[PDB]
Amino acid sequence: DGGFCEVCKKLVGYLDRNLEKNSTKQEILAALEKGCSFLPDPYQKQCDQFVAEYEPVLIEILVEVMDPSFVCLKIGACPS
Numbered sequence: 001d002g003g004f005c006e007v008c009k010k011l012v013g014y015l016d017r018n019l020e021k022n023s024t025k026q027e028i029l030a031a032l033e034k035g036c037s038f039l040p041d042p043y044q045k046q047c048d049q050f051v052a053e054y055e056p057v058l059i060e061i062l063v064e065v066m067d068p069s070f071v072c073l074k075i076g077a078c079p080s
Contacts, residue, residue: 001079002077002078002079002080004046004049004050004053004054004077005072005077005078005079005080007039007043007046007047007050008050008054008068008071008072008075008077008078009068009069009072009078010039010043010047010068011032011035011036011039011047011050011051012066012067012068012071012072013068014031014035014038014039015028015031015032015035015062015066016066016067016068018031018034018035019031019062019066021066023062023063025059025063028058028059028062028063029055029059032051032055032058032059033051035047035051036048036050036051050077054075054077057075058071058075061074061075
């Protein structure tokens with residue numbers, strides 16, 4: 001449905017600024033589970049839900065690429 005597209009891009013924007021291309025999966029996981037708390041409050045629970053649903057594929061893609069639009073597209077969050 002694309003219901004998570006906008007929050008996915010916001011969340012990956014956070015990750016981009018708090019991770020390097022170098023980061024381990026453990027570091028990426030730690031950032032993912034911190035990130036929702038830094039988004040504007042209206043997005044918090046939606047972001048938590050997004051992360052829980054997509055966490056495995058997010059970790060696998062984020063070691064390859066960190067572009068918000070591209071990440072969110074490839075994982076299916078932005079049907080586009």
